[PDB]
Amino acid sequence: DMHIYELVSRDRTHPVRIYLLHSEYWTEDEFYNLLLEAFQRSSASDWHLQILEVSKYLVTAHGFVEAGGLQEIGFPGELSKTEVRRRINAFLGKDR
């Protein structure tokens, strides 16, 4: 039962999202503490670059594996199966 750890570099037009996987659960505090650890062997760059370094350290030092990305599909819970199917068909066009 794997767990997902995301690191975000916030930006107006060029945000960075890194999704890491681990087989174990890390509490939020443990998670933050991991970044402090990374902060010791990495350069003093700004976050948009530092995020890359922290990711590299979690992977090498603690067994996180980087995922290729995340795709999402959402609907209101109240939405009938017919309207869901409606919305999906409209989205798919001829790729059905």
Next chain:
Amino acid sequence: DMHIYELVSRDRTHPVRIYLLHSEYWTEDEFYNLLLEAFQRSSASDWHLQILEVSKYLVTAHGFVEAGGLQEIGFPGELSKTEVRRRINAFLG
């Protein structure tokens, strides 16, 4: 490599997020088609129940694996390594 597929059921009080992992990459369209595929087998329920049926179908029929959840930390891209450290500490204490 490994890819994440998240199904969301939006609600006023009990939103539900389900995170699925797969070894293989599926386009959004293919992911949508997977839902239609599951719809062939599933009940006539509203989405808040349907989502659970779709998840189970993706898992048992398509080799998707459910993840336990998702945790996230974010900072402004422009933020210095110095201030990042300070926020982390502020949060921890």
